[PDB]
Design a protein around this ligand. Structure first.
Ligand SMILES: [Cl-]
Ligand SMILES: [Cl-]
Ligand SMILES: [Cl-]
Length: 129
């Protein structure tokens, strides 16, 4: 599923991501834009043999099981395919764990490089939330 911008904002808010660990909703929307283009089906292989999955490009070495990743820990206790569903629940729950790991949203490279320090509230402008 390719979410609309405000559609994704509303889903993330309903799931309690807004202000989670102090990250306002626009941070999450911005991260998802650059990580996946709001596409739940997005996947990308990493150099180490792991793969990133879903709207927030969650990695298979630490967080989810994809059956093919060296050193997998599956800390979210889910198949990585669960992160590709049109229902973002599993991605949100796992993102909550990731952002609580100590480095906040710096876990997401695209957030660091393209969202952090910017006017992230722009990402929810116009939305009814
Ligand atoms: Cl929308
Ligand atoms: Cl915001
Ligand atoms: Cl980047």
């Amino acid at each position: 599923k390719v979410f609309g911008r405000c559609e994704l904002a509303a889903a993330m808010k309903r799931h309690g991501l807004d202000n989670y660990r102090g990250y306002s909703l626009g941070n999450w929307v911005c991260a998802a834009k650059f990580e996946s283009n709001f596409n739940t089906q997005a996947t990308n292989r990493n150099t180490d043999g792991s793969t990133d999955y879903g709207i927030l490009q969650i990695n298979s070495r630490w967080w989810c099981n994809d059956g093919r990743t060296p050193g997998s820990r599956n800390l979210c206790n889910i198949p990585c395919s669960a992160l590709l569903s049109s229902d973002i629940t599993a991605s949100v729950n796992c993102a909550k764990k990731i952002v609580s790991d100590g480095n906040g949203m710096n876990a997401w490279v695209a957030w660091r490089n393209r969202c952090k320090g910017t006017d992230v509230q722009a990402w929810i402008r116009g939305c009814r939330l």
